[PDB]
């Protein structure tokens, strides 16, 4: 009640978002009502949860999310249309189990994008059209996927054009993680630049920001923001969390974060939101991949069965030290 509200603190800087599902909307309803003005479906707008079999569309869970957001004057980011994960096998196969042709996959891609985007047209203001197409390792530009294998390397151009046709007023995003590591940053930059140089309707870059206490550095974050902003795209931070474990740290037995973990996380969030506020002219939305530590995908990724404490509020929905530094930049 004396607590500052995140969306109000950052009212002149960017929207503040949370990834949700119908369960967490109930479990965290007051935090969301008190703090966010944007919502993303954590899972229920992905392909497998919208069209699990060809021509079987299951919008019920996504509808509940959109209804909640609309009834509390919250924006919605749509996540996500074309991704190498969480897409059913049927999409890439024919009746006899072999891979479809380029033309057939483009038909199915267009039908899915058209049906999904048109349903929420005028309620959802932007879409992550392509998720994580850039290779996360190695020297190649693109990660392998059945989308790319079957259609070809222009599969992303087609996806953006299909979504633009379905809702030409939506902001269309390329969304990715490890977006601040320089080698991947340059691949993402080259990819988006090349699409923009062909007049493809890509309006924004989504920086997932699945970050650790140490990585990426503040200078890497600054360099990535400027690198992407130089393309003239809008920037969203789309899945922010600050993991208590580095990538090499696969420990399972930590029952609580240490005092220094909690303090460093507070400092880290303060530094991050200071940098975001500094780039308020190009960052228009900051969405956390959750909202409080009683629900985070980092409990089971990348190590199944442990516990992480990545967000501004604790499991009892109380502000953490990170909250206070974040709102005081």
Ligand X SMILES: O[C@@H]1[C@@H](O)[C@H](O[C@@H]2CO[C@H](F)[C@H](O)[C@H]2O)OC[C@H]1O
> What is the contact surface with ligand X in residues (CB under 6 A)?
42-43, 131, 177-178, 208, 210, 239, 247, 289, 297
Residue 106 or 128 having the CB closest to ligand X: 128
Q: In terms of CB distance, is 100 or 283 closer to ligand X?
A: 283
CB-wise, 128 or 327, nearer to ligand X?
Answer: 128
* Complex with ligand X: residue 99 or 247, whichever CB lies closer: 247
Give the span between the Cα atoms of 157 and 145, in whole angstroms.
Answer: 15
**How distant is the alpha carbon of residue 316 from its chain centre?**
25
Both structure tokens of 2: 């004396």
Choose among 24, 88, 26: nearest CA to 57: 88
| Cβ 180 to ligand X shortest distance, Å | 9
Instruction: For residues 283 and 222, give the distance between their C-alpha atoms in angstroms, rounded to a whole number.
Output: 12
**Smallest distance, Å, CB 209 to ligand X?**
8
Which residue's CB is nearer to ligand X, number 4 or number 22?
Answer: 22
Strands 75-83 and 38-41: parallel
CA 241 to chain CA centroid, Å, is 11
User: Long-range contacts made by residues 295-301, C-beta under 8 angstroms, separation at least 24?
Assistant: 295/24, 295/27, 295/28, 296/241, 297/42, 298/241, 298/243
What would the DSSP string read from start to end of 179-196? TTSHHHHHHHHHHHHHHH
| Sign (positive or negative) of CA dihedral 74, 77, 78, 79 | negative
Residue 2 C-beta: closest distance to ligand X, Å: 32
Give Rg (Cα) of the chain. 19
Least Å distance, CB 76 to ligand X, is: 15
Q: Which is nearer to ligand X, 37 or 131 (CB)?
A: 131
Query: What is the C-alpha end-to-end distance of the chain, expressed in Å?
Result: 20
Q: How far is the CB of 289 from ligand X (least distance, A)?
A: 5
The distance of closest approach from Cβ of residue 271 to ligand X in the complex, given in angstroms and rounded to an integer, is 18
Give whichever of 112 and 210 is closer to ligand X, judged by the CB atom: 210
Asked whether 148 and 155 are in contact (CB, 8 A), the reply is yes
Min dist CB 87 to ligand X, Å, is 12
CA distance 7 to 81: 27
Task: State how far the Cα of 237 lies from the Cα of 13, in Å rounded to an integer.
Answer: 12
User: Smaller CB distance to ligand X: residue 310 or 327?
Assistant: 310
User: Residue 224, exposed/middle/buried by CB under 10 A (0-12, 13-18, 19+)?
Assistant: buried
CB of 273 to ligand X, least distance (A): 19
Minimum CB distance to ligand X smaller for 31 or for 180: 180
């Amino acid at each position: 009640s004396s607590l500052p509200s995140l969306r109000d603190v950052f009212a002149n800087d960017f929207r503040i978002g949370a990834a949700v599902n119908p369960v967490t909307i109930e479990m965290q309803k007051q935090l969301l009502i008190d703090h966010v003005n944007s919502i993303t479906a954590e899972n229920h707008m992905k392909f497998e949860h919208l069209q699990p079999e060809e021509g079987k569309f299951t919008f019920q869970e996504a509808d509940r999310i959109v209804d909640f957001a609309c009834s509390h004057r919250m924006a919605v980011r749509g996540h996500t249309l074309v991704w190498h994960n969480q897409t059913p096998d049927w999409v890439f196969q024919d009746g006899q189990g072999h891979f479809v042709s380029r033309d057939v996959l483009l038909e199915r891609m267009k039908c899915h994008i058209s049906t999904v985007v048109r349903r929420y047209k005028g309620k959802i203001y932007c879409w992550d059209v392509i998720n994580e197409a850039v290779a996360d390792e190695g020297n190649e530009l693109l990660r392998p996927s059945k989308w790319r294998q079957i259609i070809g390397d222009d599969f992303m151009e087609q996806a953006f054009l299909y979504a633009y046709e379905a809702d030409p007023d939506a902001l269309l995003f390329y969304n990715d993680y490890n977006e601040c590591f320089p080698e991947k940053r340059e691949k993402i930059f080259a990819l988006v630049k090349s699409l923009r140089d062909k007049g493809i309707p890509i309006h924004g870059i989504g920086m997932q920001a699945h970050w650790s206490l140490t990585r990426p550095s503040l200078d890497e974050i600054r360099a990535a923001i400027e690198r992407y902003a130089s393309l003239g795209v809008v920037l969203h931070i789309t899945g922010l969390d600050v993991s208590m474990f580095e990538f090499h740290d696969r420990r399972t037995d930590l029952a609580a974060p240490t005092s220094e973990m909690i303090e460093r996380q507070a400092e880290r969030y303060g530094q991050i939101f200071a940098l975001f506020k500094e780039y308020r002219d190009v960052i228009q939305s900051v969405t956390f991949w959750g909202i409080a530590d009683d629900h985070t995908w980092l409990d089971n990724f990348p190590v199944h069965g442990r516990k992480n404490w990545p967000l501004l509020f604790d499991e009892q929905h109380k502000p953490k030290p990170a909250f206070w530094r974040a709102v005081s930049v």
